[model samples]
Target chain A: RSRTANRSGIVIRRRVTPAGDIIVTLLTPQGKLKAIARGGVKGPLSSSLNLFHHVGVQVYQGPHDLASVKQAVLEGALPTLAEPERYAFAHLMAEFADALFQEGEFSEQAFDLFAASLRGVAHQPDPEWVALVMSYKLLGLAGVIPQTARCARCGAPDPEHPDPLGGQLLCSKCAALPPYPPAVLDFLRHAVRRTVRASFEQPVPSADRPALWRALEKFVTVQVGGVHSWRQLVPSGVPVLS
Target chain B: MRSRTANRSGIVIRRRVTPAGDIIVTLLTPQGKLKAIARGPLSSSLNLFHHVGVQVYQGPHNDLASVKQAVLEGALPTLAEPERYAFAHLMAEFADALFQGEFSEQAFDLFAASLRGVAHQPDPEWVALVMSYKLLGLAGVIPQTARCARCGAPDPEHPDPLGGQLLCSKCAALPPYPPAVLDFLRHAVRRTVRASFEQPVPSADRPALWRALEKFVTVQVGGVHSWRQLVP
Candidate 1:
C-alpha cells in the first residue's frame, strides 16, 4: 500500500476539546478517518485550522495513521447548518456516521445519506419539524426503527396500532394481544414511510407530527444503547413554538 | 351573524402540477379558505415560487399578496431552499387543524416560535422538526397529557394496551398499554407546554411523538382523509 494516498471527502465532526486540543473526523472518498491538528490550539490566528472545520464541506484528504490532514479545500459548503434547528442535524449526522462506519471503512451510501440529510436540514423553513421528520426517516433506514404501518403482531396495515410495544401494523384482531395507542401505530406508519426527498415539497401536518417523532426517538436511542451526549444537545420544546 | 367577519389563516402548501404549474394551497382553513394561484408562464419563467413560507402581510380584502413585497422571516438558512418549504408546510398543517373558524392562540404562538427557533439555531432542520409536532399537540386536537383521557386519573399506575387506557400498577396486570405511547405522551406534553431550549426533542424519540400526534389529531378532527396524504 502507498504510504501516502490523496483522497476526497466531507468533514463530519470538528471539536475543540476542553484541553484546547483540536480534533477532526472526516468521511472521505477513501474512508472514514480521524486526525489531530497539532498546533491548532496555540495559534492566535487560526484561519487555516478553522477553514477545514465545517460539516458538509467536501474536501481533499491527506493520509497518515492518525492521519494529519495534508490538504483540504472546500468544493462546497452545504450551508444547511447555517440555521439553528437544522443544526441538530450535524450532531445526528456525526452520530450516524460513527454508528455506521468503523474506522477506515468506506461508505458511499452513508455519504449519500449525510449529503442528502444536510441538504434536507438546510432546506427547512421550519427547522424544528423538519428535524423530527428527518430523524424518523433516517432512523428507519438505519434499521433501528420499530414497525410503522401495521401491528407488529398481526401484520395488519392498521396505521393505528392498539399495541404500543408491538409498534405499528397489526390488524385490529391481532392488536387485541395488547392495548396500545392506535394513534401511535398510525404515526409510525406515516412517519417511517414518508420520504424526505418528496416531503421537502409536501409537509406532514404540525398537529399530527409528534407521535411519529416520539416513536423515532424511542427507536433510535434504544437501538444506540440509550441517547448519546450528542443527542442530548438537541433542544426539546414544542416544535411549532420556540 | 353577518357581522362576524371571516378571519383568514392558512398554511402555504407547495406542489408541482406540471412543467407549467407550481401550486401552493392551505389544507384545512375552512370552506374556500385556501389561498392559491398559478405561478410562472410555461416558456417565460420557471421556479418563480422558489421561496415558500414567505410571510405576506396582507391588507383587508386583498385577494393575494405580492411575493416580492413579502418580508422573509426566520430560518432562511439553506441553499437548497426546501427548509423554507418544510416550515411552510408545518404552517399549512396548523392552518388546516386550528383554523376551524376558531382562533387558537397556542397554534399562533407555535407558528411564530417554529420560525424563530429555526432562525436562531445553528441547526435549522432540527428546529423545524420540533415545531412541526409541537404545534400539533398545542392545537388541542391531540390527547391531553394532564391525565389519562379514558379514566381521568392523574396517573396510570398501569396502562392498559387494549383499551389504550392508563391504569395504575394494579391496573397494568389486566393489560399493558404500549410503553412507547405513555413515555412519549408524558415527554411531549411537558415539552410543548414549557418555553425553553434546555429540553429539545431527541432524534430518537421522533417516531413515537409523530405517531402519537397523528392519532391524537385524527381522533380530534374526527376522521382521517386524503388531505393528510397531501402534506409531506
Candidate 2:
C-alpha cells in the first residue's frame, strides 16, 4: 500500500487541468503543497476546495513523488470575505501569501498568522487594519521587518522621523526629514511587538489610520517585492476610521 | 537642472529592495542587461514579468542608470494553470541565467517569443524545447547535425552519440542515434527561430526529442536549478 499523509491547510490558489482535474495549492502548517484533485471540477470535493476555505486534506503519494488529493474536508470559511471591499483586500492578501511562500518550506507561525488575519477580517469592523497588521507580521516572520525602533542610519534609540518610502527611521539630528506624528510612532512601536490578536485590539486614532496604512504598504513593498498591482485594487471609498 | 533621459523597451526579470526603500530592477533589453534603481514608491505601472517601456536618467557614471518612468507595453495574462505558471517561471530563470552579464538582441527576442508561445500554446513542452535549443544556439554552442563534428563527412546513419555534438559513423565510438531522431535534430538546428516553434512535433517522437534537447541545454548552461520542476 502507498503511504498517505494528512494535513490541514487553506486553499491559496486553484487551477483546472486540461483533463478536468483541479490542481490546488495549499498553505498548511507544513507550508505550501500542490496536489491534484482528481475529477474535482464535477465532483463533490469542489465545494470544499473553494478559495480561502480551510480544509483538512489526505494525500496519497504516487511513485513519482507527486501527491494527489484523496480526500478533503472543509474546516472553516470566511463569509465576510465574499463582501466586495473585504474580498478585494482578501484577494490581495491571498496573492501575497501565494507569492511569498515557497514549496516544502513550512512555517506554522506564518500559517497561524494567516488564519488569524482571515478570521480577523471576517469578524472585525476594520478589515484594512487587519490587512496591514498581517503584512507587518508576515514581513516580520520572514525576518525582513522594517526598522521602527531606532534611526536606520544614526543608530539613535528613538527616531523622531519616519521615512516610509526610504524604509528608515531618522532622528532629528541625522537628517531634516519630516517627523512621524508622536502618536503614529508610538502605535508602530507597539504594534510590531504585540501579538496579532492584541495588535488589532489596540485602538488607532482616526486621523492616523491612512498614514499608517500608507506606511505599512510602503514598508511591505520594500521588504517583499512590489505589490503595486494589488494595492491599486483597494476600493477608494472604503470607510477608514473617521 | 534635470538630467537628459533615454527610453528602451524590455522585460522585467527581477526586482530587489534596497535599504533606502528604492527598487532595483533588472531588465533584459535589446542593448543588453540593464539594472536600474527606481525611486519609491513603485507604482502599479511597473510589474514583474511584463514588458514595459522604461525611461532612464543616465547618471554621471555609466553603470548607475536611475529609472524615471516605466510604462507597460505588453502584459502576459496571468496563466491559470500551475504547470504553465511553473514552466513560465522556469523560462524566466533561464533568461536570467543566460543574459546575466551582457545583452543580445537575438536572445531578447527569443525570450519574448518563448513567453508568448508558453502563454498561448496548449502544450508548452514544444515551446520549452524550442527555447532551450534557440538559447543554446545563440550562445554559439550549436550542435553538429548536418555532418559529423569530428570529420565533415556525410554519414546520417551513424552520428555522434555525445549529446549536442556531431560525429560521423567512422569517428563515433558510441552507438548512433536513430535516423529519425537525427533528422529531427538536423531540422531543429537549421530551422529559423519562428519556424522552429511553428512546426508541430509529433507525439511519438516528443519524449526522445525532449530528452536530447534537455541534455543539450543542461550541458551548455552547467545545469538549470528548476530542472526537476520542469515537466517530465
Candidate 3:
C-alpha cells in the first residue's frame, strides 16, 4: 500500500446506496479515486450526506488502495439549489454525468465542470439559472449540443424553425416549421457561449432566457433518450414550447 | 371592449383542481403575473394548462382561444404541496411589485427554486421566503451590505430604527442599537456568500432581519411589499 491511498482531492462524483452508504468518486490531478463513506445514519450529518451525494466536496483520502474517507468537509455547496425544483434539476445533472463519463474515467475539463456545477447547485443566488448555464456549457463541451446559431438545414441564421423534430435551431425559411421564437435562438447562443465561472457576470436577459432554457431541456431530453424512468422526479407540467 | 381589452398585457395564473379539490399548481411565469386560463378539466388533452397550474398568455390575442393556444413559452416547474397556494400568493404579490413587466432570469430561476423547495420541504413558508429575499439581494433590488443604510460605518455597533442602518461604536454612544440585528445580518450575508450551512435561525431573531429588510425596501428603495400579508 502507498503512504497515501490517493492523497487529498475533491469529490467529483458520488452515488448513494438505497441503504444510505455513500460511494464517492474523486478527481485528483493524478487520476480518479473512489471511496465509500459509512456511518451517515447519525444526525444532521446524514442529511448533509444526502445533499453531499451530488456536491463537490473535499476529502482526505486514506493510504489504502481502497481508500476510506479520513476526513470529509464541504468546500462549497451550490446555493442555487436552495429549492427542491433546483434539486431535481441537479438530479438530472448527475444523471447526465453518469451517462457521459464511464466509471473511473477522468478528464480535467469534465471534472472541473462537475465541480463547478455541484458548487453552483448549493448557491441560492440563482440555482435554476446556474443549472441552465451548467447544462448548456457541458453539452457544448461534450459536443452533444445541437447546432443552434444557424439553420441546421441550410446553415442560415433563420429564427423561425417550426418543427423541433427537424432540428432545434433552424432558420424560419429553411426551418421545417415556422419556428419557436427568436428569443429561443438568442438564448441558445448566449447559454452555449457563457462560461460557467462568468454566468453571474450579468443576469440572463429574461424574455429570451426562458426559450433557450426550454430548448436546452428539450435538447437534453432527446439526447438522454426520452427521459429515463428516473427522469420523472420533476413531474409533468407544461410542455416545452418548440 | 374587444379592441381595447384585446391588446392588454398581463399574465394568466393557472389553478388545477386536484382529486381532493385542492389546488396543486405552481406559478408558471415569475410570480404568476402572466394571465392564462384553464383550457378544460384536468382530463382534457395536453395543453399549456394540462397538468400545470399557471400558464401565461402573452400571445397575439388575450381571449380564451389564444390563452388556450398560448405556447408553453417558459415554465417554472411545479412545487409538490397542497399548500402551494400560499407560496403562489406571496410570489404573485412579489411579481406585482418587484417583477411587474420586468424580467430577470436570476429572479425567475431563484423564485422557481424557492417554490420547488417549499413544495418538497416540510416548512416551505419560512425557508422559501428567505430564499426569495436572498434572490432579491442578488438582483441588486435589495439594499446594500455595507455599514447600515443610515450612518456610514463599517461596523453596525448602533442601528437606526427606521432602516436597520448601523452606526459605528462611537455613534452608539448617543443611541444604542440592538446587537441581535447586527449579528443576524452578519450571519445572513455570510451564509449568502458561503452556501454550505442550512441551519435556520429562530423566529424571534427573524423579525429584526425582516424589519431591517422591509425598511430598506420601502424607505430606501421606495418599493412596496404588496404581499406583506403572506410574508409576515
How high is the CA lDDT of each candidate model?
Answer: 0.46, 0.68, 0.49
Over the stretch B10-32, how does candidate 3's per-residue lDDT look in tens digits? 22233433322223232334332
lDDT of 1 by residue, B1-232 (tens): 1211333333333333232223333322222233443342121111221222333334555554322222111222221123333444455454455445443555555665565554344444445545655655655454445565555667663443443324555434654435554554555434643442445555465554444444555555643444355233
Model 3 residue B97 lDDT? 57
Stronger candidate by TM-score (1 vs 2): 2
Best by DockQ: 3
Candidate 3 chain A has its poorest 10 consecutive residues by lDDT at A226-235
Predicted candidate 1 versus true structure: per-residue lDDT over A1-242, tens digit per residue: 55555555555555454345556766655567666655556653233334223332223345525655444454556554655556666555555445534454445655565566666566757665555556555555453545554556655664443333432344657543333354444335566576665655555565545445434434454455522323323332312223
Q: What would you estimate as the lDDT of candidate 2?
A: 0.68
Model 2, A1-242: lDDT tens per residue?
44798989999777665557887888888888888898888997888997889999999887665588999999889888888667666765776666545454349988888888787777788887788778666766664556777877778888877664455567888755567787777767766667877777766766566657656656656665533444433322222122
Best TM-score among the predictions, by candidate number:
2
lDDT-better candidate, 1 vs 3: 3
Better of 2 and 3 by lDDT: 2
Candidate 3 lDDT, A107-200, residue by residue in tens: 6676677667767767647665666677677776553555666666677764455335433666657544445554454456676676766665
Q: After superposition, how far is residue A112 of candidate 2 from its true place, in Å?
A: 5.1
Q: For candidate 1, what is the TM-score?
A: 0.41
Alpha carbon lDDT of residue B13, candidate 1?
32
TM-score attained by model 3: 0.41
Grade the docking of candidate 2: incorrect
Name the lDDT value of residue B150 in candidate 1.
Answer: 56
